[PDB]
């Protein structure tokens, strides 16, 4: 499983 | 901003 | 399962 | 944000 | 079984 | 089993 | 940030 | 900034 | 089993 | 598993 | 920063 | 700056 975020 | 993920 | 959000 | 999981 | 949520 | 979260 | 894992 | 990862 | 996190 | 971040 | 590991 | 790694 995984994830990615950007702000 | 944004977020995504899965498993 | 998964998800994505953006603001 | 988000969450996912399973078994 | 499993689940996913996003807010 | 597994999981993934992102905030 | 994010987290993922499984067994 | 951003973050990503997986397992 | 394993894991990964990023902040 | 792995990760990458940038600010 | 980030962390990962497994066994 | 940035960081990356894996195992």
Numbering used by the authors:
A (entry chain A), B (entry chain B), C (entry chain A), D (entry chain B), E (entry chain A), F (entry chain A), ...: 52 to 58
Study authors write:
Although other intermediate filament proteins have been demonstrated to form amyloids, KRT8 specifically has not previously been characterized as an amyloid-forming protein. This protein, like other alpha-keratin proteins, contains a central coiled-coil domain that is flanked by an amino-terminal head domain and a carboxy-terminal tail domain, which are both low complexity in sequence composition. KRT8 is known to aggregate pathologically, primarily in the form of MDBs in liver disease. Atomic structures of KRT8 LARKS reveal that pathogenic mutations convert the non-pleated wild-type protein into a pleated conformation, shedding light on the molecular mechanisms underlying aggregation-promoting mutations in low-complexity proteins.
Similarly, the structure of KRT852–58 (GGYAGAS) with the G55A mutation was also determined. Fortunately, a recently determined structure from hnRNPA1 (GGGYGGS) very closely resembles the wild-type KRT852–58 sequence, particularly the residues at and surrounding the mutation site, providing the needed comparison. The glycine at the N terminus assumes a highly extended conformation, like the SGMGGIT structure. But, like the other mutant structure, the backbone at the mutant alanine is pleated. Comparison with GGGYGGS from hnRNPA1, which has the same GGYGG sequence motif as wild-type KRT852–58 (GGYGGAS), reveals that a glycine at that position adopts a highly extended backbone conformation. Similar to G62C, backbone overlay with the G55A mutation converts a non-pleated Gly55 into a pleated Ala55 (right). An overlay of both wild-type–mutant structure pairs highlights that mutations from wild-type glycines facilitate a transition in the backbone from a non-ideal, highly extended conformation to a pleated one. From these fibril structures, we observe that both the G62C and G55A mutations in KRT8 convert a non-pleated beta-sheet into a pleated one, transitioning a LARKS-like conformation into a steric zipper.
